[PDB]
Write a structure and sequence with these properties.
Structural class: mainly beta
Strand content: over 45%
Shape: globular
Protein name: Protease 2A
Organism: Coxsackievirus A16 (strain G-10)
Strand order of the largest sheet: 5-4-8-9-10-7-6
Subunit structure: Homodimer.
Catalytic activity: Selective cleavage of Tyr-|-Gly bond in the picornavirus polyprotein
Distance between the termini: 26 Å
Bound molecules: zinc ion
Helix content: under 10%
PDB class: hydrolase
């Protein structure tokens, strides 16, 4: 589990979204496994605006933050998981590392802020849903 709290937005994995998230929906995209809902309180996370390929992610299933290199956000074929069939997922970045279903929502961060959240796992790889192209999270 986990979210990003920027401005009056909450960013979560679409497959973990709550009733309250859908009842306060701003934007969602199945293909990216992302959903954004509106918040009453201001959040304090900063979204990275960069093309970094190194950062640190939180892995709840190891209680550890791991430094990783990660790929450019792309359309990647993902194996079936407990929450999606095998499919193409867009705006996904891979690293070599551990990720199980409960790790979804863990933050990937670089020197510029939050890059994205854990979304995929298995096969010795971790996949992150990028948020750096969602420039509207910085305003409004
Ligand atoms: Zn960066």
């Amino acid at each position: 589990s986990g979210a990003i709290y920027v401005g009056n937005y909450r960013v979560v994995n679409r497959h973990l979204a709550t009733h309250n998230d859908w009842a306060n929906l701003v934007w969602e995209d199945s293909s990216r496994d992302l959903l954004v809902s509106s918040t009453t309180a201001q959040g304090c996370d900063t979204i990275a605006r960069c093309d970094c390929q190194t950062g640190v992610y939180y892995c709840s299933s190891r209680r550890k933050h791991y430094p990783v290199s990660f790929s450019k956000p792309s359309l990647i074929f993902v194996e079936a998981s407990e929450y999606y069939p095998a499919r193409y997922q867009s705006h996904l970045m891979l690293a070599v590392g551990h990720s199980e279903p409960g790790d979804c929502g863990g933050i990937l961060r670089c020197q510029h802020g939050v890059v994205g959240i854990v979304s995929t796992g298995g096969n010795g790889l971790v996949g992150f849903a990028d948020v750096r192209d969602l420039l509207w999270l910085d305003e409004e």
